[PDB]
Amino acid sequence: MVKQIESKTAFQEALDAAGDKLVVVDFSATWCGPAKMIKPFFHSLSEKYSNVIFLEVDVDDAQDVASEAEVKATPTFQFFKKGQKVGEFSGANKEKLEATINELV
Amino acid sequence: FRFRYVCEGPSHG
């Protein structure tokens, strides 16, 4: 299942409600093509990996999340688990989400 | 509007 974070309040709550499954966040931009261009993958994994939690963040309308995460390049994939960070990587690499997810799965 | 920094999606290389 996916989860949209419109405020830092929903950010921490997303990790808390995420249970203990892996959690990948997509810091993209709905107005930016190159960022949303990777949605047919990250968001698609929602059906191929129903055992993984996927989040979404608007680096422009939710600058509070990007601010605390100091994001300077989109899309930025960040991995969280039980509210703790384990790894992260930016750069359009949808195939990497698979290898990274299967890594900390 | 909603603009911030560069989107290095399939734009980088």
Side-chain angles (χ1 to χ4, degrees):
Chain A
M1 309 190 90
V2 185
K3 190 83 172 187
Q4 166 161 33
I5 318 305
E6 314 185 304
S7 65
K8 202 174 71 274
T9 303
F11 181 69
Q12 39 169 213
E13 280 277 33
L15 319 184
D16 180 72
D20 174 36
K21 284 167 163 160
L22 222 186
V23 191
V24 193
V25 197
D26 173 23
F27 283 84
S28 285
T30 187
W31 68 268
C32 209
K36 173 168 172 181
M37 196 82 156
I38 322 190
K39 81 158 294 99
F41 282 82
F42 176 82
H43 152 96
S44 280
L45 304 188
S46 306
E47 310 299 319
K48 187 160 57 164
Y49 280 106
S50 60
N51 186 284
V52 179
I53 318 310
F54 299 110
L55 278 50
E56 197 173 29
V57 167
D58 200 270
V59 295
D60 299 272
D61 160 49
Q63 312 191 30
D64 44 285
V65 193
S67 286
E68 185 282 332
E70 288 170 86
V71 190
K72 307 296 201 194
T74 47
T76 322
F77 290 100
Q78 310 198 169
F79 293 68
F80 285 88
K81 202 170 195 189
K82 281 185 300 86
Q84 312 308 281
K85 179 160 65 52
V86 296
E88 56 290 295
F89 78 75
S90 81
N93 201 312
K94 42 263 275 179
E95 295 290 274
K96 184 172 273 298
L97 309 162
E98 184 170 306
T100 312
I101 286 163
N102 194 26
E103 200 74 50
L104 313 185
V105 58
Chain B
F1 55 79
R2 3 270 269 164
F3 277 74
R4 270 279 264 165
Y5 39 96
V6 199
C7 318
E8 40 162 57
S11 194
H12 177 221

